[PDB]
Amino acid sequence: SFEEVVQTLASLATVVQQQTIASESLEQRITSLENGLKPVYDMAKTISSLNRVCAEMVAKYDLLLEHHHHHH
Amino acid sequence: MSFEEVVQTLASLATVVQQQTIASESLEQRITSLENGLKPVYDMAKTISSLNRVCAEMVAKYDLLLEHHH
Amino acid sequence: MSFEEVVQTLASLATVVQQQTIASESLEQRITSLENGLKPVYDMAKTISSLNRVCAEMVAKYDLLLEHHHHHH
Ligand SMILES: [Hg+2]
Ligand SMILES: [Hg+2]
Ligand SMILES: [Hg+2]
Ligand SMILES: [Hg+2]
């Protein structure tokens, strides 16, 4: 009947609306992760400071290692 | 378009709504799984608050043991 | 609703669903980008766990050298 055409086109329109809202709601979370990932690209500067401290700590053993060379 | 074409076209869209309902739920699973990869990040981020305490307690210990020596 | 009003609402729902396809197909590209992109980001997280373990291990073992200096200097 025609009331089937009316009832169905209502429900379908409501579900088409729910996709549009949920897609933009999903799309906010995609933009979020994209933006959340950006600062990790600047990790380079921190790893360089880690590289200082990794060598600065080893340099503390300079005199102890000098003794090793003679007495081993 | 006659009344036969509306019954056909109203069903023809209902297929594509069903299709993009599943495609939306596909992309849902892919995102929700990517979000589950933050399990180590929340475990990692909490511990570093406990480990500023220990270094301040270390450095203050260092400052006093140079004061008592000098 | 009239019969011309159904085919208005149906032609209007036809044009938004085809734009909903352009969005879902565009969003899938930015997800597949994040799928590859977040791998090395989450992999670096596992290494920074190691780093914060190792630094705490230094603080502890350095505290032994401090409590040596207390009982020997
Ligand atoms: Hg460096
Ligand atoms: Hg190093
Ligand atoms: Hg500190
Ligand atoms: Hg630490």
Distance from CA of B42 to the nearest CA of A (A): 14
How many Å is the Cα radius of gyration of chain A? 32
Residues C48, C42: Cα–Cα separation, whole Å? 10
Place of tokens 């005199």: A63
Side chain identity at residue B59, one-letter code: V
Residues 6+ apart with CB under 8 A from B69: C69, C73
Pick the ligand that lies closest to the CA of residue B61: 3
Closest to C18 measured CA to CA, from A19, A27, A31, B11: A19
Residues 6+ apart with CB under 8 A from A47: none
Cα atoms in the 13 Å half-sphere on the side-chain side of B14? 13
Q: How was this structure determined?
A: X-ray
Distance from CA of A70 to the nearest CA of C (A): 25
Which residue of B17, B27, B69 is in closest CB contact with C27? Answer: B27
DSSP summary character for residue A61: T
For chain B, the domains span: 1-70
Q: What is the resolution of this structure in A?
A: 3.5
